[PDB]
Design a protein around this ligand. Structure first.
Ligand SMILES: *[C@@H]1O[C@H](CO)[C@@H](O[C@@H]2O[C@H](CO)[C@@H](O)[C@H](O)[C@H]2NC(C)=O)[C@H](O[C@@H]2O[C@@H](C)[C@@H](O)[C@@H](O)[C@@H]2O)[C@H]1NC(C)=O
Ligand code: CA
Ligand code: CA
Ligand code: MN
Ligand code: MN
Lengths: 246, 251
């Protein structure tokens, strides 16, 4: 079993591929732009990936990796009811370039399943796009489309840290994502099956993508404060969290 | 604190950078070239590095990382008394290109301290260069020069696995390297402090470098069968739990 893991208590490391408006400052990863006064911008799109590709599975041995990632994000919308568009943790093709903005979170182009996109993402959607989204803000699992194959309601604690945990169990093909707002004591979780070897390439770049609205006040910040990741290609979370995120 | 680790029970992944004659076959890392019949070549030079850079220290916070690496190597010299030149575990500048061959193991150019080399290595020297080496085969700690700052005698169990453990304790600035030949039940060790922040860049590539002789039958194989590495970089200016490490990763 090949194992690998990284843990960043803070950023500002040559370990990231920054695209769009993504930037590092105050040792935190700011995916979308924030003006001098500290307020969010419109039409922003930023992505950040770990500089080295991760092998998700091995075509020749049929082996499929199990992995887990955790990060703390902070989303602040000056006008809560105007929050848009969200942040997503994504697994994309290695040289991948940004996709459509706003509602597509920079990782997808349509709400129609397109295997050629070779992209899977867990989204934290703050703006309800009526053509495809649920009524409220939500956590969703996106498989080669912006229309989640499964979602769960999420109560956004504006400007409050969100502690996220995403795991993939190759044995059950189950992808689980949970979000906790320690300040409001709330927690959410979503789980669905994903046939990984069929939706993604053998090697992918893991990272984040975020965007803001295009109309006057539909914007918010999208900051990541810490990030851990562990992969095992042929996972004991109990020791993972302790020796990596806690 | 930032942490990084990996463990390879066999090679195959494209998480390795190969230079010179370095190659992967039979799921093992072969640093120096071998002929169809399985015999070593002359004037061979091969290097292999983890594709991702490791941060050894943080200039702005004064923090210095503690790390450990373990790997199993197998060195086979058709003619034992003709064994040359050796294999080295090295920390080099990220885009680093191979250096001098043969006695310099592909990581150094002279036996004169040159800080600009920005390279540290732990060598497993099978051939004695009278110009700077000790009389017998040895393990040595090289700091920006091929002339080790400290060495220890090593009894080469030809063609037998060598289990190596190298650790760096930022608290004591001590670098320790040990080698064990389980089949012959022998073991060796060396230690010396190294002011890491002064000999290397903030980010380095870790890996292996090996070479063979230029003269006659002075050659041998340089194969790596497995490799683990773990690093821990604090938030401010503490050793590492080698036990937990060694269990869930090597033993
Ligand atoms: C947060 O965003 C809301 C939706 O954009 C704002 O309400 C909207 O304000 C517009 C002027 O900026 C106005 O044309 C819309 O009719 C109105 N829409 C709704 C559904 O209320 C809201 O702005 C404040 O409240 C409105 C009603 C006006 O009084 C504005 O002058 C105010 O800025 C925003 N809320 C806050 C607390 O800023
Ligand atoms: Ca949306
Ligand atoms: Ca020598
Ligand atoms: Mn959605
Ligand atoms: Mn020597």
């Amino acid at each position: 079993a090949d194992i690998q893991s990284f843990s960043f208590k803070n950023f500002n490391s040559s370990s990231f591929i920054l695209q769009g408006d993504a930037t590092v400052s105050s040792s935190k990863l700011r995916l979308t732009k924030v003006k001098g006064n500290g307020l969010p911008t419109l039409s922003s799109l930023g992505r950040a990936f770990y500089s080295s590709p991760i092998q998700i599975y091995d075509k020749s041995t049929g082996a499929v990796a199990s992995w887990a990632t955790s990060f703390t994000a902070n989303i602040f919308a000056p006008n809560k009811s105007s929050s848009a568009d969200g942040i997503a943790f994504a697994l994309v093709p290695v040289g991948s370039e940004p996709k459509s903005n706003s509602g597509f979170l920079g990782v997808f182009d349509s709400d129609v399943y397109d295997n050629s996109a070779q992209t899977v993402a867990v989204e934290f959607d703050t703006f309800s796009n009526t053509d495809w989204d649920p009524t409220s803000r939500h956590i969703g699992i996106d498989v080669n489309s912006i229309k989640s194959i499964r979602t769960a309601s999420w109560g956004l604690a504006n400007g409050q840290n969100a502690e996220i945990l995403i795991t993939y169990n190759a044995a059950t093909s189950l992808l689980v994502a949970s979000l906790v707002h320690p300040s409001r004591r709330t927690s959410y979780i979503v789980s669905e099956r994903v046939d990984i070897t069929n939706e993604l390439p053998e090697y992918v770049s893991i990272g984040f993508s975020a965007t803001t609205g295009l109309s006057e006040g539909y914007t918010e910040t999208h900051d990541v404060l810490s990030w851990s990741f562990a992969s095992k290609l042929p996972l004991d979370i109990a020791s993972y969290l302790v020796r990596n995120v806690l």
